[PDB]
Amino acid sequence: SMSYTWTGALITPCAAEESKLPINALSNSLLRHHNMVYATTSRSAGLRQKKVTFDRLQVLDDHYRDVLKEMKAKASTVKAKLLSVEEACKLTPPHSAKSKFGYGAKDVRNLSSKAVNHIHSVWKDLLEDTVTPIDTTIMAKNEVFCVQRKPARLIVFPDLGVRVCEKMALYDVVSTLPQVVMGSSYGFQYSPGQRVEFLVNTWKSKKNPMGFSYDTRCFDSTVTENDIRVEESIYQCCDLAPEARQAIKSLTERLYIGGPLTNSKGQNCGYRRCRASGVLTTSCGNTLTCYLKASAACRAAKLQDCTMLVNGDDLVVICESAGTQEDAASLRVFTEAMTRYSAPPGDPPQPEYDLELITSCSSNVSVAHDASGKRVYYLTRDPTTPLARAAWETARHTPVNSWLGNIIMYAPTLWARMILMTHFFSILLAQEQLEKALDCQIYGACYSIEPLDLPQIIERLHGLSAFSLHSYSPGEINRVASCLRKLGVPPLRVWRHRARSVRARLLSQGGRAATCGKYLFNWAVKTKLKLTPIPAASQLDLSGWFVAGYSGGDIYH
Numbered sequence: 001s002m003s004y005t006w007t008g009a010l011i012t013p014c015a016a017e018e019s020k021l022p023i024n025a026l027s028n029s030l031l032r033h034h035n036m037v038y039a040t041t042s043r044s045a046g047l048r049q050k051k052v053t054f055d056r057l058q059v060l061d062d063h064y065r066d067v068l069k070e071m072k073a074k075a076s077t078v079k080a081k082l083l084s085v086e087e088a089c090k091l092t093p094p095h096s097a098k099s100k101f102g103y104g105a106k107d108v109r110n111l112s113s114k115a116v117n118h119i120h121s122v123w124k125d126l127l128e129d130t131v132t133p134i135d136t137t138i139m140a141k142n143e144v145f146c147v148q149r150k151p152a153r154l155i156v157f158p159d160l161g162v163r164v165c166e167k168m169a170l171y172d173v174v175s176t177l178p179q180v181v182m183g184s185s186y187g188f189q190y191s192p193g194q195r196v197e198f199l200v201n202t203w204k205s206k207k208n209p210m211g212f213s214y215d216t217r218c219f220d221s222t223v224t225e226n227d228i229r230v231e232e233s234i235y236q237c238c239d240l241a242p243e244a245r246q247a248i249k250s251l252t253e254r255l256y257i258g259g260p261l262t263n264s265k266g267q268n269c270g271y272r273r274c275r276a277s278g279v280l281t282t283s284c285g286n287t288l289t290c291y292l293k294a295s296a297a298c299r300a301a302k303l304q305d306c307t308m309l310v311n312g313d314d315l316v317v318i319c320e321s322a323g324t325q326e327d328a329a330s331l332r333v334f335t336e337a338m339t340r341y342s343a344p345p346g347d348p349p350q351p352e353y354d355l356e357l358i359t360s361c362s363s364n365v366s367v368a369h370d371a372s373g374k375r376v377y378y379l380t381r382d383p384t385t386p387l388a389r390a391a392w393e394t395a396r397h398t399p400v401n402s403w404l405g406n407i408i409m410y411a412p413t414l415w416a417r418m419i420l421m422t423h424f425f426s427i428l429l430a431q432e433q434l435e436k437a438l439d440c441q442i443y444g445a446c447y448s449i450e451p452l453d454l455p456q457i458i459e460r461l462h463g464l465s466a467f468s469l470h471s472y473s474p475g476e477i478n479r480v481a482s483c484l485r486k487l488g489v490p491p492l493r494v495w496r497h498r499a500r501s502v503r504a505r506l507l508s509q510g511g512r513a514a515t516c517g518k519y520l521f522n523w524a525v526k527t528k529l530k531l532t533p534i535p536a537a538s539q540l541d542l543s544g545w546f547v548a549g550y551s552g553g554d555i556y557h
């Protein structure tokens with residue numbers, strides 16, 4: 001069937017949208033080539049609609065069904081709980097889209113009776129009605145990139161009342177089931193460092209390793225009614241409260257499978273018959289579906305000693321090589337199988353024999369050296385998008401601070417330490433806002449973070465190693481340097497000078513600020529200080545951080 005049907009009514013914005021990089025007094029210090037940075041807007045949504053609208057055919061064989069059976073057996077060992085209204089409410093981001101029914105995200109969070117009462121009525125309707133399509137809003141995402149222009153991605157989401165009900169029925173399931181079903185292949189369980197460890201150990205476990213990333217073209221669009229029903233049957237394998245079962249069946253039939261699309265003006269835009277990007281099950285359903293099709297495809301292709309790593313629609317496979325000719329042939333068969341299962345490639349997969357050249361979750365393993373001169377593996381990425389976004393965030397206040405998420409996740413990297421840390425700490429010093437908590441997103445979930453806690457966060461997730469890495473690789477150094485020329489970012493020599501100042505200012509304020517100076521900026525000085533475990537690090541509740549993915553799932557921790 002067709003992934004979407006359209007009426008012709010436009011995908012509309014709520015407010016005016018900026019496409020050009022906003023400029024203030026801080027902009028030039030980060031980036032000179034302002035015309036390279038842009039934000040997607042609803043004005044390019046038509047282009048996206050064209051891309052994501054196609055017919056899906058699906059041919060399902062024994063490998064597919066055998067894997068599904070295996071998945072269901074593991075799923076049947078899961079016991080999941082219902083969340084109460086209150087518990088579900090507390091998982092709502094404070095900035096989440098307001099309800100059509102007279103209350104907003106903050107009314108939800110502080111548990112106002114107006115919000116609670118409507119949510120209760122939404123839940124009761126779900127239990128009582130299992131057929132009536134649930135309304136969704138379709139919007140264009142405003143995301144920032146460097147020119148290479150990408151059309152706006154589309155986001156489809158039900159009302160806030162429904163979203164709370166999703167959490168009630170499914171939060172525990174989507175949080176716990178994926179790891180039980182997929183084990184070590186479940187990508188969202190890993191910190192960046194645990195991800196490196198798993199990739200490195202998997203690579204080393206092969207006699208002659210070969211790996212490939214598989215990019216599905218518009219994965220959400222390739223998801224069929226069969227696929228969404230199949231995932232529900234996996235959910236229903238769980239030990240569940242009777243009301244949970246009913247709500248999940250109702251949400252599947254009324255929401256997850258498909259439904260009408262309404263713009264911000266209230267106009268009918270058409271109909272969806274594929275994955276909605278803005279539902280709680282987006283991450284879990286995509287992960288299960290990608291794992292299922294790929295596992296089956298590995299068997300169809302007779303890939304030898306396969307290990308898969310799956311993060312929603314993001315797939316990487318490591319296996320035993322049979323030489324370049326048989327590998328290329330094997331990947332073609334893999335691709336044919338995926339295509340039959342309705343997961344055809346965007347860019348065709350290519351075999352890689354250098355682990356450091358495999359990109360997965362926009363990232364690659366690379367190598368540097370710790371204090372002892374001991375080689376350490378770490379996760380990095382091309383910094384172009386992080387830096388484009390940091391430029392936007394320098395001149396504009398944003399709901400989500402990608403710079404802070406990036407500092408957390410990519411703390412060991414040369415670009416995050418020299419540029420991002422230096423730049424944004426300078427900004428926070430000048431404003432005296434070091435102590436002000438800011439929102440960031442990690443694996444789709446929203447977190448409120450104090451910048452002064454960064455040293456403890458980084459020590460916990462990465463180890464004290466992240467403050468002492470040196471002698472990065474030539475390929476990594478070249479990629480960063482190339483990126484800075486492209487965007488017109490000052491050379492790393494300027495950043496070292498800046499960091500010396502940022503460091504000194506932080507130290508001169510004592511307490512948590514000086515701790516930021518000492519650990520975060522120890523790289524900047526010639527005569528570095530001895531770095532010991534920070535006492536207050538084993539205190540913050542980092543439980544829930546790397547449990548699951550929640551893209552579009554409207555989750556706050």
Ligand SMILES: CC(C)CC[C@]1(C)CN(C2CCCC2)C(=O)C(C2=NS(=O)(=O)c3cc(NS(C)(=O)=O)ccc3N2)=C1O
Pocket residue numbers: 192195282283284286287311312313314361362363379402405406407409410441442443444445549550551552
């Ligand atoms: C392994 C880590 C380091 C990758 C970080 C990276 C690139 C970026 N970030 C943050 C931005 C600021 C810093 C961290 C992420 O959370 C994700 C990431 N976020 S996510 O929305 O959970 C996600 C979704 C999907 N696909 S889906 C829509 O769930 O089917 C694939 C992959 C992902 N991965 C990412 O993939």
